[PDB]
Amino acid sequence: EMRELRRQVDQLTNDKARVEVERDNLAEDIMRLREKLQEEMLQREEAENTLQSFRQDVDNASLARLDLERKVESLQEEIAFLKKL
Amino acid sequence: EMRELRRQVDQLTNDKARVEVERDNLAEDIMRLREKLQEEMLQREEAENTLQSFRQDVDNASLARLDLERKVESLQEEIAFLKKLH
Hints:
With 85 residues, chain A is mainly α. The first copy, chain A, has one helix spanning 2-84.
């Protein structure tokens, strides 16, 4: 039907044109999001590495504290022996 | 006649269907990327918060170690003095 046909073509062309704009823009968006994701993932690994390193420093200090506490106890015992001759 | 009109109708119909499928696919990917990005940023923020909490709590432990070290030195001095007596 000639009426119905031309009806189709006319706006079909515009409709396709609209979806192509949407598609293009989404393609730009995904390019920007991929970029952001790579940036953020590197920055997340970095924060987690800095935190891991800090925790290692804290553990190493805690061991140093324990050794000092044992050294104090030992030295106090020596003092006692000296006061006892 | 209408050959051309019909040619255009069928071609536009096929193209629009193709582009709509691609648009749907990009929207799905964007949904996933936004979700992943949110999750990555949260985990970074958690790491940064925990590091902030640890950095603001270093004084108690460090004071303890410094005083213990001073105490060891003090006791060594007392031992050195006591060792001079008969």
